[PDB]
Design a binder for this molecule. Sequence first.
Ligand SMILES: *[C@@H]1O[C@H](CO[C@@H]2O[C@@H](C)[C@@H](O)[C@@H](O)[C@@H]2O)[C@@H](O[C@@H]2O[C@H](CO)[C@@H](O[C@@H]3O[C@H](CO)[C@@H](O)[C@H](O)[C@H]3NC(C)=O)[C@H](O)[C@H]2NC(C)=O)[C@H](O)[C@H]1NC(C)=O
Ligand SMILES: *C(=O)c1ccc(NC(=N)N)cc1
Ligand SMILES: [Ca+2]
Lengths: 238, 102
Amino acid sequence: IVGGESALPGAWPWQVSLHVQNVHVCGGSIITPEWIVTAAHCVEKPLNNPWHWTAFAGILRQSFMFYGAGYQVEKVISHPNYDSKTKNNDIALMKLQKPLTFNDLVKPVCLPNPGMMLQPEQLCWISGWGATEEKGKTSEVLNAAKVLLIETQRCNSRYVYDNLITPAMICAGFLQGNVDSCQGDSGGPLVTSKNNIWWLIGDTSWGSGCAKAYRPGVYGNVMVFTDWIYRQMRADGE
Amino acid sequence: ACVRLYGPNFILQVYSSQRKSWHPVCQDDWNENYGRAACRDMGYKNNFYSSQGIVDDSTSFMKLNTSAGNVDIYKKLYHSDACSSKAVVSLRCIACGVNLNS
Ligand SMILES: *[C@@H]1O[C@H](CO[C@@H]2O[C@@H](C)[C@@H](O)[C@@H](O)[C@@H]2O)[C@@H](O[C@@H]2O[C@H](CO)[C@@H](O[C@@H]3O[C@H](CO)[C@@H](O)[C@H](O)[C@H]3NC(C)=O)[C@H](O)[C@H]2NC(C)=O)[C@H](O)[C@H]1NC(C)=O
Ligand SMILES: *C(=O)c1ccc(NC(=N)N)cc1
Ligand SMILES: [Ca+2]
């Protein structure tokens, strides 16, 4: 996260850190004790297999995520229509081998319903352990920032992303830059508060550079994937 | 089963291909056990949080057929212009969406 602030304990209790080879690679969001939403790009081959992955919940600092205390991932499911070239349909699910214990520091975010009626520039939050500057190292501390949704028509303008923003994508941030997601935050949440509920609007996906002007963050449009999520969760074990 | 929870108040709705329209479920004869069955159909396994009637902010409703057999909950609904209870189903499958400041 560029231009954010250290997260407080229990502010973002759905945020997980997803590790491979004992280091943070990606973020994700808890939706049930066993299911995490993340980005398909995170789990491209050669990291498609669950064995690579552990999840850390309820812990703000990377140095307190101890080898052996993560939750092992049992299943990885990438969206069937994910396209690595365009990053279209950039969403994946991870299922944990053992369910998480919810408490004040670990709890789920709500999946977005059709008909949320968000404002065109709805105030949202992003969180993660991404770099705090373009080309930076992983953040030791979980950060968060306020971002606004950017209307798709604006984001698709010639001076921004010039027709690259599909219906499965939403833009957020600031066209002046300075506050944005960055490498390491991908897979993590874009959330908003409505009706006293926090909703998972997006999963951090891509953008050109980080925190550059006219190059905002692009997020998977979780609304369009909810029915796929339901169907995957229902199929599991059946 | 083409079904959704709609809006920030979780209105349970069923799609009609004939009408190209979504319809809320009448609270008539509904209960938390139907709530639980609907949640299972949406893939929530043994998660359930609440099922309550609310006022609907749509004319046509889906109504529960109490005289149906043991079929899937969505095969137990039919089209009705009328909802005697004047309320529709609001269904939450999991306690979610709360944090430090809630
Ligand atoms: C509530 O359900 C009643 C029970 O029906 C059963 O369960 C439902 C969920 C569905 O699976 C039904 O197919 C199933 O039978 C409904 O009563 C049934 O209504 C159907 C007509 O829709 C009727 O079917 C006829 O059966 C005769 C007997 O063999 C057959 O010869 C005819 O071809 C069928 N009629 C038609 C219209 O062609 C069936 O017999 C009924 N079953 C019983 C036990 O009476 C009931 O209609 C429904 N309530 C509402 C408001 O729709
Ligand atoms: C994922 O790690 C990710 C997402 C988005 C960006 N760039 C911008 N938000 N501009 C980088 C990395
Ligand atoms: Ca492989």
